[PDB]
Amino acid sequence: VYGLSEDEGESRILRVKVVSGIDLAKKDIFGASDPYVKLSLYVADENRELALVQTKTIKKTLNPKWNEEFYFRVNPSNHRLLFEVFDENRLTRDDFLGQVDVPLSHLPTEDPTMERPYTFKDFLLRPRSHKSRVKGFLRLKMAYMPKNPPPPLPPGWEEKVDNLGRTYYVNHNNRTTQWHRPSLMDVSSESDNNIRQINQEAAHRRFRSRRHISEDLGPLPPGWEERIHLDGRTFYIDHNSKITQWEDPRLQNPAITGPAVPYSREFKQKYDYFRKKLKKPADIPNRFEMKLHRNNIFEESYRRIMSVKRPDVLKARLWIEFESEKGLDYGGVAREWFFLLSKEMFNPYYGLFEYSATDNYTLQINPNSGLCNEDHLSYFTFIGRVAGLAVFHGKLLDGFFIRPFYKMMLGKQITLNDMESVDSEYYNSLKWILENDPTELDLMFCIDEENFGQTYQVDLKPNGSEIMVTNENKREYIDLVIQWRFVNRVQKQMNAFLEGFTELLPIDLIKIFDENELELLMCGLGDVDVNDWRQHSIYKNGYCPNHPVIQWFWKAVLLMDAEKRIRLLQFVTGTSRVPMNGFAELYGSNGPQLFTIEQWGSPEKLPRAHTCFNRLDLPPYETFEDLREKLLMAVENAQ
């Protein structure tokens, strides 16, 4: 009844009713919006906010009908109202749907049940800034019962927006990409020398602190591996599925028997078999001399490597020399080159790669790489050679990618759950269609793409626009949307990348690993500190730092070795790296988000993790021996 009204002085009572929204603008496809109206009563001259309320959110409706009332005790000579229609379902894209500002000097006074019921008034929505697409009208009923510009960026800078809806600033002087808005003062006299150089050294120290995995009569069919346990009885284990057998699967399969030994996914033993399979092809010049300059580490390297006709030359020993450096190749130049070059290759400035929707560290192939760069297919082949060169020589790369990126190299099928790390907004809406009935959304097997402000209609399947999606065909709809959004739009780049990668390593030799272990092959194991990790965790749904289960969980993490802890870190946070400062700066889907442990489900169920919020759903296990048994399975099995 109060409705955040005012009192004292001298004023009148104004009743404002929000009726409905008409033809609200759409931002995401599927028409999935949760509009809500925020009402702010403020003072025009003072620009001071006095009252703020909001209306209940109406989910999945482009024309909602709130039909709610509020009251304010203010004078019509100094106060104004601002009704802003926002969205809830948006995670990365802006959720501003419109705004209307109304004065009070010209509002009629009429108490209810006195005169004829006045109709509903319509107000046109307006954008808050230039980068705000709004459309439609808001429905208001206001009465009085009582008788009684973008700031200029510094030169050499421009503001861009990626396909995920976020805004990042690009500098054309130092060729660097940053998220925070640049300051008016360039101060490019001390910042570069005393911050960039220090940060370069700080990043270089971390890069040297990551240890490689190996720092501790035909071929088998792809995915298989041969090992020798005790008693010397050689056995074969199929990493595809989880089966293992004594018999040789090299077309010597007249009978199927699988007693063997219990499955043991040993990452170290995978690499040892992998290393024994690489070969030096015939006669190669046992040297590879490159004279590179640090300022042009990317252009000079690209010309040299891509000028090699036969890739077999790359397999010889690397001999990298920089100008004015009279040193020796004691692993201090080959590894340095793979670090300096890694910054240029995996740089969103060039448009080849962009950051993911789950954090600001992982990288994904930019779908618009063809527009940004005319030679995108050429560079990705070059990246394939360099990435394939590091694995062959056992070096490390300073670049991490999303999980679906490693699936494509292994040639796996991308499912719905793989889009969680690509487009978070798409993943939530698509998963909603999978569970709930999409009948109310009135979706068709067609898509509407906007190019340069021009809306065009695209048919997912023939006669798509005349086919309605329902509870039966929804799974067909989900797969086509995945193909149209992610798989098909980065397939051309991935094939170009894989062509270069296979020029050094056969693709059948890399399918032994999975999408989690393959990341640690090219990047190397990190240094995860549990003491810092434990101090920066958040417990929800009744869990407390003194809870017996939480004590049992952290005791299990300590017992795990170096490899298992990183796999747990990949399982929850979605990546194998921690921020430079530490675990206090973990980033979620829509900003910073600390590691979270939540009580969920029943004791028999396995733990689940949501990479968007670094959240682990840990069921309340009765005993520590039971918790550790199932925690290891969830980390090792779930990928």
Side-chain angles (χ1 to χ4, degrees):
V1 184
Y2 312 97
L4 278 305
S5 55
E6 209 65 25
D7 194 68
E8 201 73 16
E10 183 180 9
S11 56
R12 294 193 302 180
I13 301 179
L14 167 76
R15 165 177 170 265
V16 176
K17 180 179 185 300
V18 182
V19 178
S20 60
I22 301 302
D23 195 4
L24 293 187
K26 53 172 298 180
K27 297 184 170 301
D28 186 13
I29 323 186
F30 321 133
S33 295
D34 310 326
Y36 69 101
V37 171
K38 151 194 170 185
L39 299 79
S40 300
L41 164 60
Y42 69 98
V43 180
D45 299 331
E46 302 178 0
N47 198 22
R48 169 190 172 186
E49 178 179 10
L50 293 183
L52 166 132
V53 295
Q54 67 177 3
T55 323
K56 317 305 171 185
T57 66
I58 303 301
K59 303 181 308 304
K60 306 302 178 57
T61 299
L62 291 177
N63 298 267
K65 300 187 177 181
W66 300 281
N67 299 318
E68 296 199 0
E69 298 187 9
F70 301 96
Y71 310 95
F72 305 100
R73 188 187 304 268
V74 277
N75 59 81
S77 63
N78 199 21
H79 302 269
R80 289 183 58 93
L81 300 172
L82 180 60
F83 304 154
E84 297 180 331
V85 179
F86 281 97
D87 196 333
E88 295 279 356
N89 196 271
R90 307 287 83 85
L91 264 62
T92 59
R93 297 176 178 83
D94 57 333
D95 53 354
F96 178 81
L97 293 183
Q99 69 179 12
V100 172
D101 58 327
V102 187
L104 311 179
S105 65
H106 296 350
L107 303 184
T109 163
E110 182 263 355
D111 72 294
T113 330
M114 179 58 181
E115 289 289 339
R116 295 276 71 182
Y118 175 66
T119 62
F120 41 86
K121 198 169 182 180
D122 298 357
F123 288 84
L124 178 64
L125 298 178
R126 304 171 184 177
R128 57 181 178 180
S129 65
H130 303 165
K131 295 184 178 181
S132 297
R133 294 176 171 266
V134 307
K135 177 187 59 182
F137 301 89
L138 194 62
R139 197 160 285 182
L140 269 49
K141 168 56 186 174
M142 303 179 301
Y144 293 113
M145 293 129 302
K147 175 242 63 69
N148 300 306
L153 288 316
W157 294 74
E158 63 178 346
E159 176 179 1
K160 290 187 174 182
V161 43
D162 53 1
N163 42 325
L164 294 178
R166 299 176 299 188
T167 62
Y168 61 96
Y169 301 87
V170 169
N171 181 17
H172 290 267
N173 299 328
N174 50 11
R175 291 179 295 271
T176 59
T177 297
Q178 62 181 24
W179 292 92
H180 57 264
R181 187 174 187 89
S183 62
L184 180 59
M185 45 299 301
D186 193 8
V187 74
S188 64
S189 304
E190 185 267 357
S191 59
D192 295 0
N193 178 83
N194 297 83
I195 297 181
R196 172 188 57 87
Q197 187 70 17
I198 293 188
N199 293 19
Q200 183 76 14
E201 204 280 341
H204 204 356
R205 287 305 94 188
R206 174 165 182 83
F207 182 80
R208 286 193 178 269
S209 69
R210 289 199 276 96
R211 34 172 287 266
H212 192 214
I213 173 188
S214 63
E215 296 290 341
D216 304 341
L217 300 180
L220 290 177
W224 278 80
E225 184 194 14
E226 54 91 14
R227 301 176 186 178
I228 299 179
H229 73 328
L230 273 303
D231 305 329
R233 198 181 302 102
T234 304
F235 65 100
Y236 303 88
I237 162 181
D238 192 339
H239 292 294
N240 299 333
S241 302
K242 298 295 179 63
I243 193 63
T244 164
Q245 59 189 204
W246 298 107
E247 307 296 335
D248 197 322
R250 193 180 298 100
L251 265 297
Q252 307 177 8
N253 185 22
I256 39 181
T257 57
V261 294
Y263 193 102
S264 185
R265 178 210 66 93
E266 279 176 327
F267 193 22
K268 214 286 179 181
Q269 291 292 152
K270 284 186 180 180
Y271 185 90
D272 295 3
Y273 176 80
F274 177 82
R275 183 178 59 184
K276 296 174 184 180
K277 205 60 61 180
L278 300 180
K279 301 178 182 180
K280 284 78 180 180
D283 169 74
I284 319 102
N286 50 16
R287 266 314 178 186
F288 193 81
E289 299 182 1
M290 303 178 58
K291 183 178 75 280
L292 317 179
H293 295 60
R294 195 159 290 97
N295 45 16
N296 294 335
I297 195 62
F298 185 80
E299 287 294 335
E300 187 69 22
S301 295
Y302 172 82
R303 172 162 55 257
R304 176 59 171 86
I305 288 186
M306 296 300 296
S307 63
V308 186
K309 181 186 62 178
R310 42 182 303 181
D312 305 326
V313 184
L314 301 176
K315 299 181 180 180
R317 293 185 52 86
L318 291 176
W319 177 262
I320 312 301
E321 53 168 1
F322 300 98
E323 81 294 343
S324 67
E325 293 186 6
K326 307 175 183 179
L328 194 270
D329 185 6
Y330 41 78
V333 289
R335 300 194 182 92
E336 181 170 353
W337 174 64
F338 274 97
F339 166 69
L340 301 184
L341 184 64
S342 178
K343 282 197 170 187
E344 302 291 335
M345 291 165 48
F346 311 119
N347 190 14
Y349 171 86
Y350 298 97
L352 300 182
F353 295 91
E354 72 170 357
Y355 304 105
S356 60
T358 180
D359 50 359
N360 311 333
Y361 313 134
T362 61
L363 298 168
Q364 62 179 0
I365 304 184
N366 183 271
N368 306 329
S369 59
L371 311 179
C372 304
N373 193 320
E374 192 271 346
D375 285 322
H376 64 141
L377 293 178
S378 176
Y379 281 167
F380 273 100
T381 304
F382 160 69
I383 293 181
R385 291 190 175 187
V386 167
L389 199 56
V391 185
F392 188 89
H393 296 284
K395 304 300 181 183
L396 297 183
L397 288 177
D398 187 15
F400 300 88
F401 303 104
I402 61 179
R403 212 54 52 192
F405 184 89
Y406 303 106
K407 282 194 172 187
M408 288 181 169
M409 291 198 295
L410 305 184
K412 295 181 179 302
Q413 295 295 147
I414 281 80
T415 64
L416 169 61
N417 193 91
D418 287 325
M419 281 222 60
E420 185 176 17
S421 180
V422 176
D423 199 329
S424 59
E425 184 179 7
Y426 261 77
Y427 169 76
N428 299 326
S429 62
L430 282 173
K431 188 171 59 180
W432 188 91
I433 298 181
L434 182 60
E435 302 179 351
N436 299 271
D437 202 344
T439 46
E440 60 178 349
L441 298 182
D442 202 335
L443 297 185
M444 304 298 180
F445 274 84
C446 59
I447 225 66
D448 291 359
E449 57 175 6
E450 183 178 2
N451 302 89
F452 301 92
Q454 307 175 1
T455 295
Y456 294 151
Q457 187 181 2
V458 174
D459 313 335
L460 266 59
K461 62 179 176 182
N463 306 332
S465 298
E466 294 183 353
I467 292 184
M468 54 181 63
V469 70
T470 334
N471 190 30
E472 179 183 358
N473 311 24
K474 58 177 183 179
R475 288 185 173 87
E476 171 188 352
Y477 180 74
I478 298 180
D479 281 324
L480 267 66
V481 172
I482 304 299
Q483 304 293 328
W484 173 89
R485 162 67 187 186
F486 172 71
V487 176
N488 188 26
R489 294 174 70 250
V490 306
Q491 180 62 30
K492 302 296 298 302
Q493 294 86 315
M494 178 62 61
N495 289 337
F497 172 85
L498 283 184
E499 181 181 359
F501 188 92
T502 56
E503 285 177 340
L504 307 179
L505 284 68
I507 192 62
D508 299 325
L509 301 182
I510 208 59
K511 293 183 181 179
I512 171 181
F513 308 96
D514 59 75
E515 57 272 16
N516 291 272
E517 301 172 335
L518 187 50
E519 176 179 356
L520 306 174
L521 181 60
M522 307 183 305
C523 308
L525 306 184
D527 191 7
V528 179
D529 191 6
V530 183
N531 295 331
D532 176 75
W533 193 1
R534 183 172 179 179
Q535 295 173 355
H536 299 73
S537 293
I538 302 181
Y539 316 96
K540 298 186 174 184
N541 207 328
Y543 274 152
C544 59
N546 302 334
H547 198 258
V549 173
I550 294 300
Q551 296 181 2
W552 291 335
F553 173 72
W554 290 115
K555 186 181 179 182
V557 174
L558 297 181
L559 295 183
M560 295 191 292
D561 62 78
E563 167 59 32
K564 295 181 181 57
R565 298 176 187 176
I566 306 179
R567 198 181 183 96
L568 169 60
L569 185 59
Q570 300 181 177
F571 174 62
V572 179
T573 61
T575 186
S576 63
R577 67 175 300 179
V578 308
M580 189 65 57
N581 300 268
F583 266 129
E585 299 181 355
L586 285 184
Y587 267 91
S589 180
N590 56 338
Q593 172 71 16
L594 305 183
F595 186 87
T596 307
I597 294 181
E598 179 186 14
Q599 179 176 10
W600 171 94
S602 56
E604 63 275 7
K605 303 187 67 59
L606 272 66
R608 302 190 306 103
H610 311 283
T611 67
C612 296
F613 315 102
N614 305 341
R615 180 190 313 275
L616 182 63
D617 299 357
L618 187 67
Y621 297 100
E622 298 184 355
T623 60
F624 166 78
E625 53 182 355
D626 204 334
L627 177 137
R628 194 188 65 174
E629 183 182 358
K630 294 186 181 179
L631 175 60
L632 297 185
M633 294 178 55
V635 172
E636 182 176 352
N637 163 267
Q639 303 171 13

